[PDB]
């Protein structure tokens, strides 16, 4: 199954996607070749955009201001 | 160097990221572990959000309405 993260982002705010160190390379590459990552603009509430990300469990999703 | 794509997205519009079939698995996994993918909300022009994506060259970036 998939991890799902939707966050409000203002101008100049972002997200970094990386690979989790504890998951194996053969499997992550197969997660990403086969199904990929989906980015969705879910809502635009004025000066904010709610961005959804659906990604296999091996993908680390971190808001830029955290790391 | 990096591929860069910025597109206007309205509500319910998205992007799919996948891995290019012609690039080797060892290298792509190392592209993504080391540097990752950056998603940036660059501008919110009313009912549209301009979403930037910076990704290593091995990553295929496709607007949902194309494939």
Numbering used by the authors:
A (entry chain A), B (entry chain A): 0 to 66
The authors write:
In bacteria, the highly conserved RsmA/CsrA family of RNA-binding proteins functions as global posttranscriptional regulators acting on mRNA translation and stability. Through phenotypic complementation of an rsmA mutant in Pseudomonas aeruginosa, we discovered a family member, termed RsmN. Elucidation of the RsmN crystal structure and that of the complex with a hairpin from the sRNA, RsmZ, reveals a uniquely inserted α helix, which redirects the polypeptide chain to form a distinctly different protein fold to the domain-swapped dimeric structure of RsmA homologs. The overall β sheet structure required for RNA recognition is, however, preserved with compensatory sequence and structure differences, allowing the RsmN dimer to target binding motifs in both structured hairpin loops and flexible disordered RNAs.
We have solved the crystal structure of RsmN at 2.0 Å resolution and report a distinctly different polypeptide fold to the domain-swapped dimeric structure described for RsmA homologs (Gutiérrez et al., 2005; Heeb et al., 2006; Schubert et al., 2007). The asymmetric unit contains a single RsmN molecule, with the electron density allowing model building of the first 66 residues from RsmN out of a total of 71. The RsmN structure is distinct and completely novel compared with those of all other RsmA/CsrA orthologs and reveals that the 16-residue insert between β strands 2 and 3 has the effect of redirecting the polypeptide chain to give a unique dimer structure. The RsmN dimer consists of a very similar ten-stranded interface held together by a sandwich of two five-stranded β sheets assembled in the same order: β5-β2-β3-β4-β1. The structure lacks the α helix at the C terminus, but instead, the 16-residue insert adopts a well-defined α helix between β strands 2 and 3, with the sequences represented as β1-β2-α-β3-β4-β5 and β1-β2-β3-β4-β5-α, respectively, for RsmN and RsmA. In RsmN, the noticeable difference is that the insertion of the α helix between β2-β3 sterically prevents these consecutive β strands from lying adjacent and antiparallel to each other within the same sheet. Instead, the α helix forces the polypeptide chain to cross over to form part of the other β sheet, such that the RsmN β sheets are composed as follows: β5A-β2A-β3B-β4B-β1B and β5B-β2B-β3A-β4A-β1A. Thus, the overall folding topology of the two polypeptide chains and their dimerization interface is altered by the presence of the α helical insert, making the dimer interface no longer domain swapped but the product of two docked folded monomers. Surface area analysis shows that RsmA buries at ∼4,453 Å2 in its interwined dimer structure; however, this is significantly smaller for the RsmN dimer (2,841 Å2).
